[PDB]
Design an enzyme around this catalytic site. Structure first.
Site, short mmCIF file in Angstrom:
data_model
loop_
_atom_site.label_atom_id
_atom_site.label_comp_id
_atom_site.label_asym_id
_atom_site.label_seq_id
_atom_site.Cartn_x
_atom_site.Cartn_y
_atom_site.Cartn_z
CG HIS A 111 -2.04 -1.06 1.14
ND1 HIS A 111 -3.34 -0.83 0.74
CD2 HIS A 111 -1.97 -2.35 1.52
CE1 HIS A 111 -4.02 -1.96 0.82
NE2 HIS A 111 -3.22 -2.89 1.30
CG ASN A 119 -7.90 -4.22 1.26
OD1 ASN A 119 -7.21 -3.22 1.48
ND2 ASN A 119 -7.29 -5.41 1.21
CG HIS A 168 -1.67 -1.02 14.38
ND1 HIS A 168 -1.93 -2.27 13.92
CD2 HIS A 168 -0.93 -1.22 15.48
CE1 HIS A 168 -1.38 -3.19 14.68
NE2 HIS A 168 -0.77 -2.58 15.65
CE1 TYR A 214 -1.65 -2.32 8.68
CE2 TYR A 214 -1.58 -4.52 9.66
CZ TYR A 214 -1.97 -3.66 8.63
OH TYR A 214 -2.77 -4.12 7.63
C1 HEM Z 1 -7.80 -8.31 5.76
C2 HEM Z 1 -6.59 -8.16 5.28
C3 HEM Z 1 -5.83 -6.81 5.14
C4 HEM Z 1 -6.29 -5.60 4.90
C5 HEM Z 1 -7.75 -5.17 4.67
C6 HEM Z 1 -5.17 -4.70 4.90
C7 HEM Z 1 -5.24 -3.34 4.60
C8 HEM Z 1 -4.15 -2.51 4.55
C9 HEM Z 1 -4.16 -1.11 4.18
C10 HEM Z 1 -5.43 -0.36 3.72
C11 HEM Z 1 -2.92 -0.64 4.30
C12 HEM Z 1 -2.37 0.79 4.05
C13 HEM Z 1 -2.59 1.79 5.20
C14 HEM Z 1 -2.17 3.20 4.82
O1 HEM Z 1 -2.86 3.79 3.95
O2 HEM Z 1 -1.15 3.61 5.40
C15 HEM Z 1 -2.09 -1.71 4.77
C16 HEM Z 1 -0.74 -1.67 5.00
C17 HEM Z 1 0.06 -2.64 5.58
N1 HEM Z 1 -0.35 -3.94 5.79
FE1 HEM Z 1 -2.27 -4.55 5.85
N2 HEM Z 1 -3.99 -5.39 5.16
C18 HEM Z 1 -4.38 -6.71 5.31
C19 HEM Z 1 -3.57 -7.79 5.63
C20 HEM Z 1 -2.30 -7.61 6.13
C21 HEM Z 1 -1.50 -8.63 6.76
C22 HEM Z 1 -1.92 -10.11 6.95
C23 HEM Z 1 -0.34 -8.09 7.11
C24 HEM Z 1 0.89 -8.76 7.78
C25 HEM Z 1 0.67 -9.65 8.76
C26 HEM Z 1 -0.36 -6.71 6.70
C27 HEM Z 1 0.71 -5.86 6.87
C28 HEM Z 1 0.71 -4.56 6.43
C29 HEM Z 1 1.78 -3.64 6.60
C30 HEM Z 1 3.16 -4.00 7.23
C31 HEM Z 1 1.39 -2.48 6.07
C32 HEM Z 1 2.20 -1.14 5.98
C33 HEM Z 1 1.83 -0.20 7.10
C34 HEM Z 1 2.73 0.95 7.44
O3 HEM Z 1 3.85 1.04 6.87
O4 HEM Z 1 2.23 1.75 8.27
N3 HEM Z 1 -1.58 -6.42 6.11
N4 HEM Z 1 -2.85 -2.88 4.90
#
Ligand code: HEM
Ligand code: HEM
EC number: 1.11.1.6
Lengths: 727, 727
Positions: B102, B175, B366, B389
């Site tokens: 993202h 999402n 987060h 996060y």
């Molecule tokens: C239902 C499943 C998921 C959804 C809906 C989701 C949604 C999102 C969204 C919308 C963002 C971006 C946030 C922003 O605009 O800064 C993001 C970032 C991220 N996602 Fe999730 N994600 C999902 C699953 C996961 C999983 C399973 C992991 C790891 C275990 C994960 C790890 C991350 C990380 C590390 C970031 C970057 C955040 C940052 O740098 O602050 N995501 N995700």
């Protein structure tokens, strides 16, 4: 479970294959026998995979890599799951800051070797012996866009080369135009902020077509020369293999006697110069944003190794002040008609990296990395560059031990008293960490300067002046170099320049900015100024129509080496043709086509309205590379339509459109037998037209016509006919 | 110097203006009166500029910001130039790691308000009173691409909302599709690595159309559900305003009585659901890689505030096991036909940021950031997210004090015993930095859980089972949700899904991977599988033709909420129409056209073959927004061609192409008077055809007909007719 197909088709053959014939792969797996000293020294850190157990980073074998550890199968994840936490932690921490500028770039390994010893003008060890090879790593790049931006944007291109010499790393960090936009390094952040995405909304990506860029340019006329190059077709090269490279600054060569000679560095593309046309290049940013990256990688996998000739413009120290421009001003080129480029060596890039991040992304180049036999000059842009690359790399690469990241390590010896720092690899055993010391008998020791293997000593240039923040008055001339460049372009190149400016300025919201840029153009050339004004609906005043043109550059009214195309230099090896199939291909045409393509080293891509296979009239099974829509004419150099069952594709909208686009973008089209019925789609000529090859069948003559067109790159004479076509 | 124009035209008016009318600007300058509590609390770090002296970061005024300090005006740059060095140093260290996933996103400020108290089901303070306003900051994003990749790629979209509540930050990180690709967080690095650019050459950017993605999907059938959504038009939304949003996971609402209720979070776009078509999206990635970012920003500058309704799917604790699918499985949706979405509140986005880097780039969202009244569940994907996060933010944002970066700070009180860390802003005066303590009388103190303002206490869910790394057997079902989704789509949507898979599989180089995905499609639906296979030249085997279709989902054979278009919900306000001018426009037509659009909040862009002005038949001077080639039909929702001197543009290739492209992409076109000569260009019969508005003039029902077409978004009935057409 989930395993390789039985037939072994999951893995690429380890031999040179044409683009699209096999899955691309890591260089050391694609070309295991391609070696050089640098490539070999990277073997301490290469890691295989086949036949090994999956483990943690601490070496513990993992039994189940599909599930977190939980209290019951539908229960909560436990904190004690260290396998999951190391796996996610390492993933969470993958990213490192991208380069401040030139974040988007593509690199490869290769080797350099001089044509003859240059010991009379330099003591640099890598230029001293024709049979002494120096390993290189080269990264080509765009300037403004992020690491995920598109390749074929309009932009200056970087061309950085790391030479792993016997006396130290030498990085020659240049661009694809002989001048830079600004004179003094203090204005770098200002220029870069103006061309980068605007601070409130972070738009637009990878483009100069927006108000802050044209604002800056209109207020800083020193940028006009490099802006002319950027708006010409030099800003949209067809490939990194078909562009020139230049160090821009005047540097010095120092020989063993201590004589200093001023030098400007050039790279000449041995595949010749060639660029896209704007509409094609912009559409290509959407159809294939990794076009240049892909093309470089594929050419190397195919054996079409990018080759460049290193050349030097040499100016005796006593001629420092003899031009009508300052040699130390980076907004000024040195016309080859005045100081010819002397051929120096050849550089060949023959191997892609294994891992993009480890080798390309972590590579660190620095114009300050010189060696004995080379030295700087007071160019004020270069001067501030020496400070910046070192500084940025401490946060980009996480500390001061970036020279220990595998791609960056010297292959020659390095010993000193620097210690510690984040992620220190080298374990020093020296009892001393300072000099002078007696406890290690003062080793490692300083080495006096000398003819070979000597210590670095700066050329003792005389310095005389007061401490001032002042631009040299000799740098205050901004229009004659732009005019020289304009006047050396062909008519169709001049039109493309007019069109670059008209397109760009039309995206400038504030109209006065447009006007001010037009006013600056009026100081360069009234014909150019009026042609851009007309596209912007602007009317030049009487005063603007009376601006005297700048003077010639040392008597020059043009220099043909400044044009991409005035002097023919076309090379078809490594180019690619689209072959539009039908479901009953006349195999005799294909055969003739493919044989002649193969003799000239030209590649082909078999296209159809669906994937899979089609069978020719003789039973040959032809695998389809891509569909008409999926691999657009943008991605090829010419199009060929063999005969067969033409009714199969005669009504196909994508096939018809394929040709209209190719036609619009001035590419050679060849039509055999019933394929000539497609001539009505590109609504033009019945007796024929230069640029369109046609015949009852694809023969020796047909293919020579097509290959000759291809060698001239594009059909410039068709320009007048393309703006009625709806494509 | 005093470089602005004396007319004051460098400065956009601080009032709502239509897209393109003025230069865009930092939120607080464009809408100074649009305030909220969070916007007001950021005033301590907002920095102005006008009328201030230019200084170093230490406050020292600068005299000459154009030049480095040197020994002579052509001499070497001096190390003592501390102004140059601070300036280059800050520039050199501007970048920070982009988000792991993202990385590409666009954000805005707004506010949320609930329709009624939800105290019966949740003690969450932001939902307890309809007059309680919660400021929000929202970021929309793509998934795979870098920060510099394109907006309109095919991809899931992120939709993250930061709620600045009085009892803490609550981040709702969802999402634009109701399920995710994978079931357990341990495979996130595997899935993400498979979808990201392949490691050897870092290609392709921002796309799943490559071997490693499809390889992973074909070996992990749990991904098919979300792959279906991504292959449909859901993966290429027209705008962040016209897409749905989902939390995906089942969470819990906890009321004051301690009762837990299961909830799935939804966001309904009040502008309706609308997507692009693939060809248009792809082309838009090249013509304008910042289309979504731009549209979001300009929508808010025009007053077309993006508005969404927060909705809850509520399921009693007793119904946990009543469905065919596990509620804790993130690859399964909850059909609205089984559990209706209950409207909860309205979110309005009404102000852009001031600085993209400071507010958008450093925003940290987060899903573990919940507040009293909410709680987690054992969904195994969610469970691992709670770890990730927090972890990733230590490196991306430089330390554990990222909550002190202005955009991330709570607006409510925060006090604890945590100290130090890099970039520590808060200067704690508490004598104690530990508890229990007596030296500060134990402050700050713990607070018991209670109905309002109490401490957080987790819901006491029973836990039972062994420590296992095991997928729940209830999660092992992969095809019925994909099938339900497929059957809920209109026929033109199904075709678009078939085209998505076909195009994507066509870029997979290893044919066996294409075969394996086809075999999986055959377990979902035979019609889908056969159509994709035909596009790839693959034949299903007799066994594949006899695979039994998966069961319905709890008796449902379709659910129209899953379609984008089955149930009309068109909203025209904020859409944009291209008006193709000529050099003597009937001003009567233009007046009718402009007024009617304005009446519905429909924007217009006046286009021509050059910039500048043209004069209407009555002498009205018409300002041109862009050329036909400069603002292509890809960027508008409809095209209107008024009468006048049509011969002026009748033979203009770009003008003709403009209509061909808009016609191909199913957009409404309206031709007035002589503009009907363009009917031949798009092959329209004399009698006309649904989707083409034509009349002798733009009066009467002409605008009402075009606006009815705009309300239905695109002309799906035209699909068969576009098949052909060369564009
Ligand atoms: C239902 C499943 C998921 C959804 C809906 C989701 C949604 C999102 C969204 C919308 C963002 C971006 C946030 C922003 O605009 O800064 C993001 C970032 C991220 N996602 Fe999730 N994600 C999902 C699953 C996961 C999983 C399973 C992991 C790891 C275990 C994960 C790890 C991350 C990380 C590390 C970031 C970057 C955040 C940052 O740098 O602050 N995501 N995700
Ligand atoms: C003639 C003028 C210049 C040329 C030809 C040039 C060329 C380049 C090239 C080719 C790269 C990318 C190297 C790679 O592929 O990693 C680069 C990066 C960079 N340039 Fe220069 N540049 C010029 C001017 C400047 C100036 C004036 C400054 C600052 C004073 C500057 C600061 C940087 C920095 C900080 C980087 C990133 C280096 C890294 O992160 O390792 N450049 N430049």
């Amino acid at each position: 479970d989930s395993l390789a197909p039985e037939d072994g088709s999951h893995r690429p053959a380890a031999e040179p294959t044409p683009p699209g014939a096999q899955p691309t792969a890591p260089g050391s797996l694609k070309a295991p026998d391609t070696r050089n000293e640098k490539l070999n020294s990277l073997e301490d850190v290469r890691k295989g995979s086949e036949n090994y157990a999956l483990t943690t980073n601490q070496g513990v074998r993992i039994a189940d890599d599909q599930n977190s550890l939980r209290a019951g199968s539908r229960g909560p994840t436990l904190l004690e799951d260290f396998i999951l936490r190391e796996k996610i932690t390492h993933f969470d921490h993958e990213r490192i800051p991208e380069r401040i500028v030139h974040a988007r770039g593509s690199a490869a390994h290769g080797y350099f070797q001089p044509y003859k010893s240059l010991s009379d003008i330099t003591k640099a060890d890598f230029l001293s012996d024709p049979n002494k090879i120096t390993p290189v790593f080269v990264r080509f790049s765009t300037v403004q866009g992020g690491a995920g931006s598109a390749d074929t944007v309009r932009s200056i291109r970087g061309f950085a080369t790391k030479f792993y010499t016997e006396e130290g790393i030498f990085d020659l960090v240049g661009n694809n135009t002989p001048i830079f936009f600004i004179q003094d390094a203090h204005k770098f952040p200002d220029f870069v902020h103006a061309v980068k995405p605007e601070p409130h909304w972070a738009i637009p990506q990878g483009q100069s077509a927006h108000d802050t860029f044209w604002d800056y340019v209109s207020l800083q006329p020193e940028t006009l020369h490099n802006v002319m190059w950027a708006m010409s077709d030099r800003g949209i090269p067809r490939s990194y293999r078909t562009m020139e490279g230049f160090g821009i600054h005047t540097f010095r060569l120092i020989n063993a006697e201590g004589k200093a000679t001023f030098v400007r560095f050039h790279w000449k593309p041995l595949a010749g110069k060639a660029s896209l046309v704007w509409d094609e290049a912009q559409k290509l940013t959407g159809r294939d944003p990794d076009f240049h990256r892909r093309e470089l990688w594929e050419a190397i996998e195919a054996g079409d190794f990018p080759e460049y000739e290193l050349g030097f413009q040499l100016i005796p120290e006593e001629d420092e002040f003899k031009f009508d421009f300052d040699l130390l001003d980076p907004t000024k080129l040195i016309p080859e008609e005045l100081v010819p480029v002397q051929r120096v060596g050849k550089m060949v890039l023959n191997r892609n990296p294994d891992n993009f991040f480890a080798e390309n992304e972590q590579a660190a180049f620095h114009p300050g990395h010189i060696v004995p036999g080379l030295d700087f000059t007071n160019d004020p842009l270069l001067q501030g560059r020496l400070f910046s690359y070192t500084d940025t790399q401490i946060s980009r690469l996480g500390g001061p031990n970036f020279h220990e990241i595998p791609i960056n390590r010297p292959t020659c010896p390095y010993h000193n008293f620097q210690r510690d720092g984040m992620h220190r690899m080298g374990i020093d055993t020296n009892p001393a960490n300072y000099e002078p010391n007696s406890i290690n008998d003062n080793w490692p020791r300083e080495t006096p300067p000398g003819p070979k293997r000597g210590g670095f000593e700066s050329y003792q240039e005389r310095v005389e002046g007061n401490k001032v923040r002042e631009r040299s008055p000799s740098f205050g001339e901004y229009y004659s170099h732009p005019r020289l460049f304009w006047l050396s372009q062909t008519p169709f190149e001049q039109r493309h320049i007019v069109d670059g400016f008209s397109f760009e300025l039309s995206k400038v919201v504030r109209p006065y900015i447009r006007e001010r840029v037009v006013d600056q153009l009026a100081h360069i050339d009234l014909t150019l100024a009026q042609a851009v004004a007309k596209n912007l609906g602007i009317e030049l005043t009487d005063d603007q129509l009376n601006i005297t043109p700048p003077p010639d550059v040392n008597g020059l009214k043009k220099d043909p080496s400044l044009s991409l195309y005035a002097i023919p230099d076309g090379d078809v090896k490594g180019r690619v043709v689209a072959i539009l199939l039908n479901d009953e291909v006349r195999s005799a045409d294909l055969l003739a086509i493919l044989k002649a393509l193969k003799a000239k080293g030209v590649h082909a891509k078999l296209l159809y309205s669906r994937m899979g296979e089609v069978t020719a009239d003789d039973g040959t099974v032809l695998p389809i590379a891509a569909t008409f829509a999926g691999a657009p004419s943008l991605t090829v150099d010419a199009v060929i339509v063999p005969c067969g069952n033409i009714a199969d594709i005669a009504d196909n909208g994508d096939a018809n459109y394929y040709l209209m686009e190719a036609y619009k973008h001035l590419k050679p089209i060849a039509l055999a037998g019933d394929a000539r019925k497609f001539k009505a789609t590109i609504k033009i000529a019945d007796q024929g037209e230069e640029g369109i090859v046609e015949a009852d069948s694809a023969d020796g003559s047909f293919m020579d016509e097509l290959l000759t067109l291809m060698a001239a790159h594009r059909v410039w004479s068709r320009i007048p006919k393309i703006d009625k076509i709806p494509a």
